[model samples]
Target: SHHHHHHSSGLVPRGSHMDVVIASSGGGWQEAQDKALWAPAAKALNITYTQDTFQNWAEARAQVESGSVTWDIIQIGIADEPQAKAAGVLEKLDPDIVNKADFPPGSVTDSFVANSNYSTLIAWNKKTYGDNGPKSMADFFDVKKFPGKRALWNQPIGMIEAAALALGTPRDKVYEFLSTEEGRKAAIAKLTELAPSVSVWWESGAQAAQLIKDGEVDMIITWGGRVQGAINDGANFAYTFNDAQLGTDGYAIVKGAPHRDAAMRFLKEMSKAEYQKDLPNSFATAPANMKAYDLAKYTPEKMATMASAPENVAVQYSVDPNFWAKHAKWASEAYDNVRL
Candidate 1:
């Protein structure tokens, strides 16, 4: 009997005592997990949270089929959301963790609900571009005007879509172009146009920000939160939100999470507006709780850079999860073969 639901007067407290194995995709977003989330989550849920590394989803699949899911709540990528839900490896999301209506449609899907959005867009050195810089995805590839070393996301998730957008594909048709063999190959070619100028083919958000800050690259594609970290450290970094690739990393209960009650309560705690508001200060992620916007005290200028900023939000679009779920296996292999 490892589970204990602390009850007071026949009603359970905010949460039961337990240790939740939270699998996180380690790298830039790691700071948010420890600094922004875990501590407050710990107090509200009355539980201890442990960090686990996310290596591969195949590992999760292996564990789920074997009846041994060690990760109680694992970090899920937006593209993987469809696959995770379709595989039946995750448990049902509890209804108590904020109402569904509070978030945008895709943010609260059955597979997983996002706590914040991780934005990958056109981040450039302010010294290089001044105020008028790259405005859209099209500008990202136009080296004749904004020419210098650039850093591109290593994977195909957001990269492909960005390439298609720059290649004259409409936002609504972004996935349609990516679904075909010619479109995918065209995307690779578009990305390759910058290859000769690319100083760093970034694999993580941290590295993407560092490339700009360290002066290795003039422009980059990276997470909004990571860029914020660099700016806090006094990097002259600026980015555009128009046609930004917005994706989410969210929690999903492992198929057979040991402490089910604690997991639900932990999610409920995360859903609170107070805690969600704190996400932007350090992590740069737009909180999933819409109410958090009202609570946020960040300046209008700083808020404008955030993914949730009304200005940024208006032009931003959701990355197609189903497209990746359908083509990721081949796309990943294709990227590895071409990326230098």
Candidate 2:
């Protein structure tokens, strides 16, 4: 039916056919995605790779709506997928090109496929608490038992979700709790109670990582990969996925991609377990494909720290991007009122 169908025999080298561009916010993770995913996919599809940096959804939307969709595929947070789809900035993903069953449950969709995930977990400077750091979200809020400067994301989603979990709402019910005005108020009120203890309300992942790495705060709410980077840099830090918030970022095609056929084939190549298994070596973010763990590259010690590992996933709340997509604006303003 299409040029891509001819090469559907699996990830094998094809003659150079076309060029595709991948967009991401460049960093070490992007470089790793390049080496582990894009590079290999390019070879398999015989497509030359072009790279660009993404700013936000608005930019992605503008390009597509304006009929200048330069990027074939772009990296976006899982939470943003629904909104992007609604805005008509994304193309309908072909399930035939990329198998949906290969990904973790709730990770694949009509318009997107997550390739990696990270956890927003409670992490503390081990130098401050030794091995006695907060073990759960409940412990993170118990100022009497574990007193210290606390750092939280200035954003509403992670803080409010964690607060809901910390206040004894069951993991399954946390999103439902946040769905109500009263429930959101309760979560915000809980954050307000701990406001004075929050020495820093971090605005970015980089800031959150630096805070823990520099020992600027005793306990912090941040992504696992950021904290892992701090630990890798020799920061004495300990974190738990217990009661953590799991988030993912994935690839989406621009609504009118120039190299649509090549992009689809590239995604198919990239989604394989063989390619996904190497993702952890680049960052603590886990492969979206559950089968990647069965490969030898993921060790027991590593999986224990990974957010998407069965054990870690059991203890954490996989963020419902649909919930956040519908509620982020309201949640952001509500969080501001309490934190302000």
> How much does candidate 1 score in TM-score?
0.78
TM-score of each: 0.78, 0.87
Tens digits of lDDT, candidate 2, 54-148: 67978989987777777889999888888899999999988675565655556778888889878888898888899999998889999999999
* Top candidate by lDDT: 2
- In terms of lDDT, model 1 sits at 0.76
For each candidate, C-alpha RMSD in Å? 6.3, 6.7
Candidate 2 residue pairs in clash (backbone atoms < 3 Å): none
Which regions of candidate 1 fall more than 4 Å away from where they truly are?
1-63, 69-71, 94-101, 281-284, 336-340
- Model 2 earns a TM-score of 0.87
Residue-level lDDT of model 1, residues 1-340, one tens digit each, is: 5865434598554533477777787876776766777788878666787777877676788888877776777777766778877887888876666676666446667658778876777878888888777888888888897888778777777877888999999876787887788998998888777678777778877667667678676888777778777878888887778888777767777787887678777877776778788876775568776678788876888678767556676687777787777787887887776675
Worst 10 residues of 2 by lDDT: 1-10
